[PDB]
Amino acid sequence: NEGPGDILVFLTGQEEIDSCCEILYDRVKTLGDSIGELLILPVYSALPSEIQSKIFEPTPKGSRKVVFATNIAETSITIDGIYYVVDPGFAKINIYNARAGIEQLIVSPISQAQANQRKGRAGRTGPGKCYRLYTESAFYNEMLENTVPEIQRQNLSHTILMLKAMGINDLLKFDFMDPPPKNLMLNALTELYHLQSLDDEGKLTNLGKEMSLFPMDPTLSRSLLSSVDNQCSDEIVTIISMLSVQNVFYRPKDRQLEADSKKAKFHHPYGDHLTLLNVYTRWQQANYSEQYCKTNFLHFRHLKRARDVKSQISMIFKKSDPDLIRKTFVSGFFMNAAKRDSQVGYKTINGGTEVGIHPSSSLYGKEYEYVMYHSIVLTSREYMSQVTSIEPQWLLEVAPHFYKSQSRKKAKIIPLHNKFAKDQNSWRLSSIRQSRERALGIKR
Amino acid sequence: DLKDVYASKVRLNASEREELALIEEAYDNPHDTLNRIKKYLLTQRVFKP
Amino acid sequence: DRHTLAYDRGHRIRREFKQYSLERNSPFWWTNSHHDGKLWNLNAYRTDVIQALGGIETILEHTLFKGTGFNSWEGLFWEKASGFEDSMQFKKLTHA
Amino acid sequence: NDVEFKKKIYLVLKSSLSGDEAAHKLLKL
Amino acid sequence: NIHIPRYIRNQPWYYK
RNA sequence: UUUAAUAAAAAAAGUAUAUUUUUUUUUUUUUUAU
Ligand SMILES: [Mg+2]
Ligand SMILES: [Mg+2]
């Protein structure tokens, strides 16, 4: 019931975009009488480039085109023909809890600036329409004023290294426009202290300066220093190249199980990091071909970027035992480790957070007792990512300074569960006492 | 298997209440009673009737 | 809970030798339900006896159900609490 | 007439712990 | 109903 | 081809205590932006 022009529908996540596009396609299959055609295009982050290019297509035959998109159409996209906009006003923010140790992806309401960019994306041609399901006073009052800071949002363990290598002796001497809470900055400085890059005096070490000279993550930079010292460099740097790039594997709906067979063909049972060596050595043995990573669903953008990053790291260097590789990663990642508990699955070494293995990993159907995880995501369930088997000898010989009872004393046990008892405390002498004194009718 | 005897009855003579109290204590602080078992397996050699 | 029953070894003989250290014996000294399952089921016997006696009509013409005046036999089934004797079985009470 | 007959045959068949005993009862019918 | 047992809710074979 | 059919109640004084066979496990593959 409105004029012609392309439509941009502001959505949140890939599952949400897929479900809304499916419901709209089922509605367009229902509305088969005197309705204009609705060309559908979804826009997600890790979408294929041939399928990410389809959003810029021409309009239908006298009819409407609709791009169901995430926040990518906020500032880094420019679609032609857009005359309509429907904005629900929600996004996904990455909130990093440092003391807990994880990062949550939480749905957040849009501020004034993001809603302004969404309303301004409607008028790239001329007089368009912006429909945002909100009252005007509600959109003015309940929405946040300006953009929230990236210093207060993400992990500051990387930028604190650069501001320390600059030479600022105090944190408030930097005097940012929107400073983070110093709990987060103090935890980031604590982690960078534990990585042996910061000395006890508060100044950067010589190896701390050498690791601050690197562009990677500071735990990855410590693993780089270890791979330089222990002469096992090239495979370590290859795994760091596969790590710094986003996830290589693709999961379609038509070819899901064949992609599962390709993943099962790839992955090494010692860990998940070694599978990335298998993928990189397979792509280098294939001489960066298109048919090989087109069958095995390895993304060519991500594979070429991994090649570029590995070549970049070898150039900035210029100016196959699994055991040494894994120990070289212990040198970087001794902090984020996990202990397999039989009752609750996995406990964290720091804080005791009940975490889990993601099913897309290599290590899902299998179990090892002590594992270290590269990343961790707070969602409906915790998930660890890039999980490798590890031995506690390595976690001691690398870090005798983070650690070397009381938890044994505070523990308790409960008997085996039976179905027939209907209350598994009624065997006790206290419960027999209470049932006796209730049947007699006294009351304490 | 020590608990399994007392699943049935609610009328208890004092010896059974003594056994159930010892079982409930051993369930409540398990490391302490386990350490006690480790001590008795080493330095006890004269037993009761 | 199978992960803590992976450690219970030697259990048939442990269950058999309870005759020398327990007064109240057990008839099922040979099976252990956690390790071995429910090896028998007698639910259909209670269905076929009611067809054997002729049904709820030919059972209830023997009983005193007609004099109570419930509407239906289906209300014979409740979570019946004992009341008096439940209170009285715990008291200090003579042998006689 | 069919259902009550199946019930009589089933109840004959479903006592009588031997095959010879159920065969005796059914040939006695 | 919740109260009736499963030996009464079951119909035998020959009522099927 | 033919045939085997037990029982059946009054009075007096008692009695320890636990005894059990009965219904699936819950294990979900999703991470905003490059
Ligand atoms: Mg007398
Ligand atoms: Mg006498």
Coordinates of C-alpha atoms in Angstrom, one line a residue, chain A residues 30-31 52 82 89 111-112 167 184 242 271 291 314 349 359:
Chain A
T30 CA 0.4 -16.6 0.4
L31 CA -0.3 -13.1 -1.1
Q52 CA 26.7 -11.1 -0.6
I82 CA 16.5 2.5 -1.4
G89 CA 16.0 -0.3 16.7
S111 CA 20.9 5.1 20.4
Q112 CA 20.2 8.4 18.7
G167 CA 55.7 5.8 27.5
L184 CA 38.4 -3.3 33.1
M242 CA 44.8 -18.8 10.8
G271 CA 43.6 -30.6 19.1
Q291 CA 38.4 -26.0 -6.9
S314 CA 57.6 -13.5 8.0
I349 CA 40.9 -22.4 36.1
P359 CA 29.8 -28.7 18.3

